[PDB]
Symmetry: D2
Subunit: 496 residues, 4 copies
């Protein structure tokens, strides 16, 4: 998921729209924009689909005001395609809306506590609504009006004490302004920017990645610190505060591997440079451990791995060639009566340049291996194109554990690397050779760009969950949400 918040001095609807379009890679299932208009009323538009589909002209005239937030959704457990999208809002106290990228590992406990202690009903299975109501709950304790910046930060600190997990948040409070905060482990990305209009008026904005600042012409200020809260008033004043105890920087490693855009700077690390480094480490590991193998060419599985594969081919002194081409437009397969629905995917997504594989030992480079069924089909494509020996290299280490911090991933039993050594995986997907990035090499590659980062969020690779509340009972709660997600999507399909 991706989030945007613009506290400006002129209409922000188009800017939020433009900022979401450059974060569209963080989620293409749904989109939502909400603004505070001249009467201090939320104005909202959200629906399923791409940003360019969700917001028509008639919806943009509705989104009046100089302050607003936006959200694009990646389908996760609890926030399915058939579900209501973000942002949510409650009308008491004062009026609050919130957009969220991440996941709360104690969502179930929080929902119970909200109902019993506050009689606050949660109408969806999205943990973002829960986070919103916790925050609204803590804000309701203050009776005097208006709230002071210290009240709002106090409410944010109380929230960080109650909730566990990973979250980058932006929110608005009618009559006050815009806030943004980050989990105490700094897992999910969030950056702050500004744009000076004159010596009196300055606009601010936050976003999941710096590219959203670049595209609008905002000067980059800094990443929002772990546990830090940003508050920008309706007049245009910026306040900050540390709202967590023992904050630490444990940025998500997956952001650098493939999820974030290469032209972004997350916690002072160029995603592009990090990915080039990954290819250096992986190319070095390959030259060391596959010295005896005959590799004719290095070919990337586009698009994420093109720069990584270029560096590997350099380390190995081997040619780089564009053997696979990814179609920019995919298109849907229709549920067809009296027509065969036996087509296998991946042929839509990718195509093979037949001349680049014929009678060659090829080294394919992909960003990661999850289920392996996709990887199998890519290797099959190479063989059908004429490749003899087909070797596969993964920019990421083996993916053995589910992510519970905002990155949608299948359960452990669906991960091919779960409970298997490398050779088993190789034999299953049909490769002649298979190699994975060493986790220490991946850490070094990203850590090289910012040595201040001591540890990263590596749960999917090593099973170490930094929040320390991931047990089998919690994993079962998520599999329940996924069961209900499938039933809601299925019922929509029948009705169409």
């Amino acid at each position: 998921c991706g989030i945007v918040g613009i506290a400006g001095v002129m209409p922000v609807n188009q800017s939020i729209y433009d900022a979401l379009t450059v974060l569209q890679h963080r989620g293409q299932d749904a989109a939502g924009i909400i603004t505070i208009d001249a009467n201090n009323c939320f104005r909202l538009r959200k629906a399923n689909g791409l940003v360019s589909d969700v917001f028509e002209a008639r919806h943009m005239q509705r989104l009046q005001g100089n302050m607003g937030i936006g959200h694009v959704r990646y389908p996760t457990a609890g926030s399915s395609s058939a579900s209501e999208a973000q942002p949510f809002y409650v009308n008491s106290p004062y009026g609050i809306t919130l957009a969220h990228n991440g996941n709360l590992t104690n969502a179930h406990e929080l929902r119970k506590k909200l109902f019993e202690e506050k009689r606050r009903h949660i109408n969806t299975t999205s943990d973002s609504e829960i986070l919103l109501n916790i925050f609204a709950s803590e804000l309701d304790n203050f009776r005097h009006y208006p709230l002071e910046a210290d009240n709002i930060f106090a409410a944010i600190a109380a929230t960080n004490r109650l909730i566990r997990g990973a979250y980058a948040c932006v929110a608005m409070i009618i009559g006050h302004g815009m806030v943004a905060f980050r989990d105490p482990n700094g897992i999910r990305p969030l950056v702050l920017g500004k744009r000076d209009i004159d010596e009196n008026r300055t606009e601010y904005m936050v976003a999941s990645e710096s590219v959203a600042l670049d595209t609008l012409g905002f000067d980059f200020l800094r990443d929002v610190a772990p546990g830090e809260a940003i508050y920008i008033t309706e007049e245009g004043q910026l306040f900050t505060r540390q709202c967590a105890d023992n904050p630490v920087s444990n940025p998500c490693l997956f952001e650098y591997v493939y999820f974030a855009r290469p032209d972004s700077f997350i916690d002072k690390i160029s995603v592009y440079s990090a990915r080039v480094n990954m290819g250096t480490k992986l190319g070095e590991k390959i030259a060391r451990e596959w010295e005896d193998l005959d590799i004719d060419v290095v070919i990337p599985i586009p698009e994420t791995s093109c720069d990584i594969a270029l560096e590997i081919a350099r380390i190995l002194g081997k040619p780089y060639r564009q053997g696979f081409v990814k179609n920019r437009y995919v298109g849907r397969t229709f549920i067809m009566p009296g027509q065969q629905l036996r087509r296998k995917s991946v042929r839509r997504k990718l195509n093979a340049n037949r001349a680049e594989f014929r009678d060659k030992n090829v080294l394919l480079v992909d960003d990661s291996i999850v289920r392996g069924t996709t990887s199998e089909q890519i290797i099959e494509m190479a063989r059908e194109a004429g490749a003899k020996k087909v070797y596969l290299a993964s920019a990421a280490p083996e993916i053995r554990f589910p992510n519970v911090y905002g990155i949608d991933m299948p359960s452990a039993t669906e991960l091919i690397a779960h409970g298997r050594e490398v050779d088993e995986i190789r034999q299953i997907i049909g490769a002649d050779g298979l190699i994975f990035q060493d986790l220490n090499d991946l850490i070094d590659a990203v850590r090289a760009e910012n040595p201040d980062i001591q540890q990263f969020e590596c749960s999917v690779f090593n099973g170490v969950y930094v929040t320390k509340d991931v047990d089998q009972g919690y994993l079962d709660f998520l599999d329940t949400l996924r069961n209900d997600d499938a039933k809601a999507v299925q019922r929509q399909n029948e009705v169409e």
Copy 2:
């Protein structure tokens, strides 16, 4: 506006849809249906347009559950075409949704009190949202769970003490059931019905008119009494209570004149029979006061006045003839560039049977006269068809005051009868003769069908407002809402 609530034992989405389609005459601007599904979650669909336009197949699969309410909107001050429609809902306490037909005369005072005392933000200008939050406010005072029927009735009584005006309401409370109540003056119509499925399970429903019960096969029980509250639990148990002090039955007279359907029974009065009576009284007044006039034929302005005109023609011993035909489908006029937009309305709505007017002194019968510009154009049509003397009779008395109890009407300065005697109106609209129903005759005609009714709501005719809080300052508040309503509709038109 019209409302429906069905507390059933099997899915209610289609029933609510079908019930709204037979109440569509109470408002064609927007529609909304909301249900409580098997997970005790509100499921909602609302938008602008007709019932048959708003609810597609994909929206009806979303509306799962055995309990729900529906609403169709007539555009009023505060609830414009460009606005968010009903029903609204809040997620605290417990979860409440409400649909409303009427108007709160102290909406401004209530909005202030809600913000200061409860920090409850009202995001729209609809008084229905205000009514919802007052009710939610009183429900939040109870901390123990679950609420008892006496808690809910206590909250309704507290609400009736705070709010003033006219309202028929239906609402749901997650985890409890469905409630419905009526203003202490019984101004807005509301009836209760049931449908027995077996000796253990009975379904209940409420609606603005009895035709909604008829069309679904529900047995009519009774009108909801003035100030009375109905409560139906999730198990299927019915409770009632008087929730107002000094309740009285002052049913709206306009419902009988034209707004309600003729096959409905409102407060034990057949709307059809009431309208026939109106023609008897008006035919008697005409024979008395226009003895010397030469009337060739009685012609109704369809559709409401066909039965009224039939009775007048009978009293006068004169022929009845269908001189005007109303087109069932109207269609829109497009804002056209390089095309003349000088067309006058009424020709779309009505057409004249040329042979029924030629060389005749015609007595036209309409249900009421409001602005008079429409009436002028109807008289003009008759003359263009060949009529010599054109006389006009109004089933309703002169309309001199605005309605503030839920019937959308223009301000007093826009009412032709405001500050004018009959002959002035006649001279302005271009009639050779003009006559109005005497208010006492109208009361007798409706009161004849149920002599228990001592007084009716007659504010638009005599300026007597039964709630006793209609001053010039309140009339100014409504003209502000209408100013903002026009600006919102205008901005939508520009953007299309």
Copy 3:
């Protein structure tokens, strides 16, 4: 179906739209408008649904020009809801478009001749496309340019020699103007009008009924004569010609019974006056043959029969009362899985005023009886409302044969009156008494308004087909078209 053609001197898009809206009662399945723009290019918009749904703003800007035709479709065999709508057009010779109300009884033979002799492919099962191509064929024989009025009339005469059946047509020929013609039996309605703009420029139009002329402010000239052709040039000149031998006036009787609007004048006969006369004749027949029966009240099945029942009640000296109310809005029934829909199919269209039936012997009046399942269910409603004896009277004679002249009707085996006497029908539908208009009385009632009309098209009542080419082979051709139409409609819902 209904048709409109406007040969004007200023944009006609809105005029055609407005004229179709008052002809919408002739078909609500699809609508189409096509104009000739300033570059002599057809500009088209057609789709399924009502006029008000089909034509958005974006389509009306496309419909530029001062000449155009329109069509609204009633679902028939070969042109189902799932099919391509009217108007059709071919781009050779010159460019021709046509709209048509009626039916060709030799459609199969014509399609064959078109394929073998002219290699003209007919892409749909609509007989209108065939009619367009026959006319286009005859127009291609003339080689010199431009065509002269006599050329076009010659082509129309040649077409009338080839095609058999009933048809009212309007068409345009690029570079020439607009034509309109009528079948040699004058079965389908068509009227001509004009509107003077100044001493130099006059606009003309044609339409199925005179109400389309009235609503746009066109002066009625006359019905287009049987077999006559009208031609209106781009300059604004009117020419005519008799283009059939042995033209005769056998106007469709159903137009007067229920299909046309009451304020229309078809062949100088007021539909309204004709229907009152029908009620006079039937009231006279009822009093004679049911002298001994006890009738409490006369109640019409709305809407067509309200005036007919009023006249019957007058002849019988009995009260008239609105016992049935037709629901103005119907709405769709959604295909629902695992869901009981217990609304009755008769309750969809009608509702019963319970107080008007209870403990009375009622005489229901309907316009006609076709399948009888509907009549059965309406009689059932009356009994459930409290009626004791329920008698039924049909404004039309028994319907025993299918209509092949443009009025959609089921086959003879589906008509309850087919091969049955009156009393058998009575026993099947559950009436205590059943009586039909005598065909001779129906002719008298319509003939009274214009004795010049000697005979009418009465095939559905007596089986006399004036075209004399209705054999078993044509009936099988129609049941084949109905079979394929159902499979196409089924496939749309399958995929929806």
Copy 4:
């Protein structure tokens, strides 16, 4: 534009849809699919937008049959976004549909001849409709039925004698089969394929590029020869014929520079290999003529030029870096009243990685330079990102003349290179250095992959038009089409 034709033995709707999605890069303005169903009837769906927007489920059930063609449109003169899209069809003779990629340079003369000699009206400004009608004309000369393969080839040969320009075409003839042909200069790309189902049944298809064959699993046979015609019968038989005299292979050079996909093989030339060769030639020219310049890094303007810049960086022994990232999703800019849009038009498409430009002399590589305003703004981005000296290299030679063979380009007066030397252009766009590919080097690079190709279509670079009918009169005809196209597009937004 791009075209597809599938003559199969099982439903082709999804296959055509899938093939257009991998040809979507050839035109994103409109899309169209038409099939011949079991009753030998054209079944069509076309509209504006992307393939994934144009074809819903309801349209794919309509597209029944085992034979069909498809088209995706690039906006050109005469077929603007606001215009009717391809494919077109006529219903005489027999029924013919056609899809076309290219442009007819004698369109005006052809429209005249069609009107006078054949009275065939052309309803749009698309030259494809003209091409369809010429072919239909020649097919009508044959009177006996069925047509024989030699008849159809005779009609194609006659058409090639009449029409001038560049064209790749696919078409269907009801009752016969599918045809495809290529202009006598082999300018526009077209390839043929097959797919064996069993020893009895083989499917065939044609398409603009080989990637459409690959993605569906069709074996590549060969490019359709210049002037050659392909005919595939409904039974599954392949015939061919040379249908032009003096056919020659002058393939479009732009296809290789940027327009075609890199994994395609056009006339036995890999687009990917050709582009690498272009970069080799340009890198060699740069090292020779810019020996003395200080270049820090080579940066491509994505996406077409990434591989070209990679090869340049290799020749120069300099680092390659992803300095520019192309935004995958662009989104629309809404016409906003009273609202400042301060996003820059270059920022819409591209974003700059600030760290890759700061304090470096950068060599930007783009595929071509047309207007120069874009290049100016990209150079400006580099400087704002921190670049010192910014040098620009164009993979294509200077573009001085308009393309009249199917590639949309502005007129010569809008081309910055028109009437200017290299250094003047450099001064205007703001580069510190500017260099272009030598046309002779470009020919060598493409010619290396297939020396059998002696000459290419190079009109845009050198003004040599191989058709020899590009005069000032045709250029005025095109600027007229562009004028009317703009007025139609303007009128759509006015009314939206």
